[PDB]
Amino acid sequence: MNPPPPETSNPNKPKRQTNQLQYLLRVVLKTLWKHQFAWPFQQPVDAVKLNLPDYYKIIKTPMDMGTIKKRLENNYYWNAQECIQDFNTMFTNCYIYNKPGDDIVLMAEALEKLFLQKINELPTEE
């Protein structure tokens, strides 16, 4: 079975709309989403569909860009570090679960290199 997906809505969680979070949606997410290697990362790992009965035995902090997109679009975050953590979690999960040099790892590595360059350019808070 798949787990419930990560939370994307919680009215009890205080929220901010900030220029750094706006950058994360408008620049970081947009650049990553349209990348040729993005599709495996655009939704939670569907362990049923992929016949990976062990995925959620190994990965206990799942994350994906579909979830990040929802979090950004629905103003889930307080700060940019929260969002950056979600991207990092997504990449780390892929590296933990998969063999080095697997296609999925090569794809994650490509996205991560692009991610790091965009994050290095994160604007100062207004």
Contacts with ligand L26 by CB under 6 A lie at: 39-43, 45, 50, 52, 94, 97-98, 104
Q: Scanning the structure block, which residue is given the tokens 């798949």?
A: 2
Of 50 and 116, which has the nearer Cβ to ligand L26? 50
CB 38 → ligand L26: shortest distance, Å? 7
**In the complex, minimum distance from the CB of residue 54 to ligand L26, in angstroms, rounded to a whole number:** 10
Closer residue to ligand L26 in complex, CB, 66/119: 66
64 and 43 in contact (C-beta within 8 Å)? yes
Shortest Cβ distance from residue 36 to ligand L26 (Å)? 12
Q: Which residue is nearest to ligand L26 (CB)?
A: 40
Q: What residue type is assigned to position 119 of the chain?
A: I
The secondary structure of 54-112 as a DSSP string is THHHH-SS---HHHHHHHHHTT--SSHHHHHHHHHHHHHHHHHHSPTT-HHHHHHHHHH
Q: How far apart are CA 57 and CA 2, in angstroms?
A: 11
CB of 123 to ligand L26, least distance (A): 29
